[PDB]
Amino acid sequence: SCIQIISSSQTSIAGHRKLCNKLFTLRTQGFETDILRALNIILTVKKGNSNADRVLRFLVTFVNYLQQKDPEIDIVQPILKHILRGLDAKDKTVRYRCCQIIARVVNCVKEIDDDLYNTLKEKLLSRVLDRESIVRLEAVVALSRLQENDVRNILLFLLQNDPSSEVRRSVLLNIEVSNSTLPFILERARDVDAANRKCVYARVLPKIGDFRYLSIKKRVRILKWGLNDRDESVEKAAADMLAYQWIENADNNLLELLERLDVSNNSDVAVLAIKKFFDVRVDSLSQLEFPEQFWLELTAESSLLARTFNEICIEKNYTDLLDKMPEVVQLTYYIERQYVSLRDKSSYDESCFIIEQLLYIGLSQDMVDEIGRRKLLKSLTNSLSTMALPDSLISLHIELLRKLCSSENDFCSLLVEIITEVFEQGHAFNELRCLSYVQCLFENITSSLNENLYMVDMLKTLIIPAVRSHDLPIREKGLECLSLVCLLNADLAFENVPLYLHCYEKGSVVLKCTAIRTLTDMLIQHGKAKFTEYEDAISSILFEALGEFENAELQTLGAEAIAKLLVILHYRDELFLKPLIIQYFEPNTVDNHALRQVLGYFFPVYAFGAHENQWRIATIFCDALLSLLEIYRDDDVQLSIGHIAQQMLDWTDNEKLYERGDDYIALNHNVHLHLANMIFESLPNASEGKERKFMISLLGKLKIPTDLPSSDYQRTKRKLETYESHGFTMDSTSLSILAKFERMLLQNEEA
Amino acid sequence: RELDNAIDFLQEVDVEALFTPKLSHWHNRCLLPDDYQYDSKRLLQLFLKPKM
């Protein structure tokens, strides 16, 4: 009857309206009782049942249908009183169904009796800490119906620390949105689960009416994460929020939106946002117009838009769209108008940004227009000779100059003439500007052919005098200039290695960083064999740098230098691979996130690039891991080591090679079976206890293929036996791992 | 559907029995590694001549 109506809603949802009417004929009765009887049978069904949700969907549907009309019958209060008793239960599903039901039923109306309010709150607050994840999920949904502090603070706590992604998402989807709760939902934009990240852009942020409510630094941090996200869906959700919601708050005026991003201080994010907006809204790209008026009233946002539009069309090859960008003749004119604005300080910072954008547009052009090429060259030749551009624009000016010159020789000739004229004027600020021109000169040439005389000149006239100057800024700038000249001549590089070694030991941190970059670049540029006389001295400073956890910048630099020397040159990999792994996992360096970022990228690239790189890691694996054990004993010690070891094991797994001619892969020895041999030979030097126990634990995690030659399995068993002959005392699990490993070897020989 | 779930709502149930009356692992607080900052292009660039 009344219960069988419910049992009939089991199959489908279409008839729910029909059954609501018939059941609405039996209101005046064992009404209440029969429903609770139906729910008592919903507590027995385990999760995963399409029905239980259908039945429960039918009930929430009928309740609402009942409040409209004949609200005389208050059935939400009895049903909640009956089911709250089960919040404390041992069948996790009785708890999960109870929370499931309460969450949906309470949502059917707001007016509740206070005693029903308090009791439900007290019991639910304990539930959201349930041992099962499914209970927590439905509990926060139920609890979130009694929001408004203590209520709220608990949701922030699970959202932030709950180990289950589905739970976090449920909290993320029902928590209140306010400046107090805002910082934590934005953190989820970097959640490990893609769906949780996508939820922040797709559902949670739209709840905020306007993006202006956020601080400018919040707006930028959002787009930086969203538009660069690794997952195609999260990245799409962030681009849609930017291209359909945020553009709306800015009156559908892209410029007005750009003005709310402080583009001059957030250039990289602002460019990406523009590009992503037009990936979503390609129709708008063809609607931008750049009349003469546009270029005479340029702004920071207006100029960035043109530079990005030009950047897109070139990449996308939208040739007809590029016809809207000006010719170099007009561009040279637009730049020169902007120079005038540099005289007035109130418009100085913006004009530097505008000029920057125009130079980028100019660097993009392939100007067959000799006429306009000559004009822009004159303008640049003049601006560098007479004006006092900031260090920021100097580089782009000299870079664009190189692009216009017919060859490196004409570029050196011209730029030396400019440097000499600027040098005559001053005869501090003047000399530093000259050296900045010298620095950009040697940054834009690649070989020393045909420019010996220009070099010997810059050396005698500026660089050496600067290197010997007692004024600290000039000396530092002179050394950077000297370094770039060493990258053009190997013999000069070799002649100055002693100087840059003297810079590291007796110099400041700034000078140590100059030495690391210089010596590293001389090796990469000129080759490894040229400097073998200084091999130990250079490696020394690379070691010392990597161990200075006091200087995050210097430490990160040594780590980076080693990384590129290994990948590019294979520069004593064996010697550095172990100190690198130790420092990378060392606790004293954990706070240095810059270092963990470069090595976070290097190890996968190095390990997974070649079979020989995985072999080198297994060769020092044990010694690196043992060194970390000693370091770690001095919060949880055993748990972190396990994650470290599994990382090193993944690096050495042959299956994880990226892979890309090798006819003789035949007798390549398996790195993991080679690592087993390493472990057997190192167990004696381990200290009995967790250490020797832990090293044996790794034998069970190894990935040994079953198609290797028999002599390989035979060789490792010999290693196994040699270790067994020591007669060390081992616990049960150790002996079980060794026995299971020894039998695996036999089985793979047999096959 | 072919997959009968399937529920018999006339079965006998004992309410008191079902109603008969926290968890501390709870580190790496579910956030991606910092890896978007390092421009992978830096590795194969010279420190002093990035646009090489």
Number of helices of chain B: 1
Count of strand segments of chain B:
0
Count of individual helical segments of chain A: 40
Assembly status:
heterodimer
Shape of chain B: elongated
How much helical structure, as a percent, in the residues of chain A? 55-70%
Alpha carbon gyration radius of chain A: 35 Å
Calculate the terminal CA-CA distance of chain A, rounded to whole Å.
Answer: 67 Å
Number of strands of chain A: 0
Helix-and-strand structural type of chain A: mainly alpha
State which percent range the strand residues of chain A make up. Answer: under 5%
In helices, the fraction of residues of chain B equals under 10%
The general outline of chain A is flat
Largest interface: A-B, 73 and 38 residues
SSE sequence of chain B, one letter per element: H
Write down the Rg of chain B: 30 Å
Major sheet of chain B: size, sense and barrel closure? none
Distance between the termini of chain B: 65 Å
Question: What amount of the residues of chain B lies in strands?
Answer: under 5%
Secondary structural class of chain B:
little secondary structure
PDB class: cell cycle
Keywords: SMC complex, cell cycle
Assembly: dimeric
Entry title: Crystal structure of the S. pombe condensin Cnd3-Cnd2 subcomplex
Q: Could you describe the 3D structure shown?
A:
Chain A: Keywords: Cell cycle, Cell division, Chromosome, Cytoplasm, DNA condensation, Mitosis, Nucleus, Repeat. Chain A: One of its GO terms (cellular component) is nucleus. Chain A: Belongs to the CND3 (condensin subunit 3) family. Chain A is mainly α and 751 residues long. Chain A has a domain at 406-488. Chain A has helices at residues 2-8, 16-23, 31-40, 50-67, 76-84, 92-106, 114-127, 133-143, 150-161, 165-174, 182-187, 194-204, 216-227, 232-249, 254-258, 267-280, 282-285, 292-296, 300-316, 319-322, 328-341, 348-364, 370-386, 391-404, 408-426, 429-443, 452-467, 472-486, 490-506, 509-526, 535-546, 552-569, 573-585, 593-607, 611-633, 638-651, 671-682, 690-701, 710-724, 732-750. Helix content of chain B is 10%, strand content 0%. The longest helix of chain B is centred in the N-terminal third of the chain and has 5 residues, at 15-19. By secondary structure, chain B is low in regular secondary structure.
